[PDB]
Design a protein around this ligand. Structure first.
Ligand code: BVY
Length: 318
């Protein structure tokens, strides 16, 4: 309905208290019967609302569906994001972000329940995943894109880790794993010129509400979900809030710290050591061992032929 997310916004905003249907009616200037219709449908979409006579309604639990009205409360208090666009469907949050950033300097993120044309690095190709693009505006040289990628890696990792009993680790430079299972991929893009960066665009894809049980019985050998490693149930909104808070903390770190400061923490969180890696670049594939991540975010590799490589970026397979 026209007023669904306003009612949702009021219900969420008032937790942990009950709120009366009259209050909602007065707040939106609609009748108490119109409110009942909205709240009923809220329930039939899977919203869990407790309604007791004379006292009102209490939002107890949100379903596995993004609601604009809820996310507006997140951007309301955010010292980072100016707004957010929530979609049930879209070709790609990244495509939407790259269009919406043009002509302005606002910081925002774009969320969609499903993507019809999601693309990751090199143009590689249900409500069980998080698909989000984040637009930030750091006043830095375009060289610093590699450095941003390193920082938010730890941010995304920390958020997933908080909900995972098993340990979450980074496959440099663009992926997150829990044990053998890849749980997230992300890429960092930018709009820049010689004089600096006009925007950072960070697309993040995370296998979410996929409770042991849940997640699709496919590649249970190298793909996993956050919740196949959480005893309790995983709420998307509790996760998203933790994820945004970590993105902001790591973003400010990116602005204030050299990579030297977070480097040892990054290495302790990487799963690329002490194993033979497969490197793809263009024509050629070759095997190698990662020796070190140097002071500048460059991976130091010794290939199977003994030769040394120093790579800002890489396409790595296990
Ligand atoms: O459109 C969009 N992108 C972004 C945004 C929101 S999600 C984000 C991209 C997320 C990418 C992570 C998922 C993923 C994994 N892989 C691995 C792969 C696939 C195929 C061949 C291959 F060698 C490796 N590819 N994608 N909106």
């Amino acid at each position: 309905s026209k007023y669904s997310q306003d009612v949702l916004q009021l219900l969420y905003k008032n937790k942990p208290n009950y709120i009366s249907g009259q209050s909602i009616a007065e707040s939106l200037n609609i009748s108490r019967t119109a409110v009942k219709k909205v709240i009923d449908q809220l329930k039939l979409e899977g919203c869990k609302i407790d309604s007791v006579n004379h006292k009102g309604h209490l939002l107890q639990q949100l379903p596995d569906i993004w609601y604009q009205g809820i996310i507006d409360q997140y951007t309301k208090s955010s010292a980072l994001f100016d707004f957010s666009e929530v979609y049930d469907s879209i070709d790609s949050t990244q495509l939407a972000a790259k269009k919406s950033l043009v002509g302005n300097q606002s910081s925002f993120f774009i969320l969609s329940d499903e993507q019809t044309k999601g693309r990751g690095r090199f143009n590689r190709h249900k409500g069980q995943g998080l698909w989000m693009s984040v637009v930030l505006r750091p006043n830095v040289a375009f060289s610093m894109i590699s450095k941003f990628n390193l920082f938010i890696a730890l941010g995304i990792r920390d958020a997933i880790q908080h909900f995972s009993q098993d340990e979450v680790k980074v496959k440099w430079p663009n992926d997150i794993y829990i044990d053998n299972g890849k749980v997230c991929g992300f890429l960092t893009e930018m709009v820049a010129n010689n004089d600096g960066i006009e925007a950072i665009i960070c697309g993040i894809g995370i296998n979410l509400t996929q409770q042991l049980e849940n997640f699709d019985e496919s590649i249970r050998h190298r793909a996993t979900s956050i919740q196949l490693h959480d005893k309790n149930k995983l709420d998307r909104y509790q996760f998203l809030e933790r994820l945004l808070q970590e993105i902001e903390k790591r973003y400010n770190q990116f602005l204030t710290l050299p990579f030297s400061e977070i480097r040892e923490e990054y290495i302790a969180a990487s799963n690329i050591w002490n194993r033979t890696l497969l490197f793809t670049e263009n024509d050629k594939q070759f095997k190698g061992q990662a020796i070190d991540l140097d002071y500048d975010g460059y991976l130091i590799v010794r290939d199977e032929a003994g030769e040394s490589h120093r790579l800002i970026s890489a396409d790595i397979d296990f």
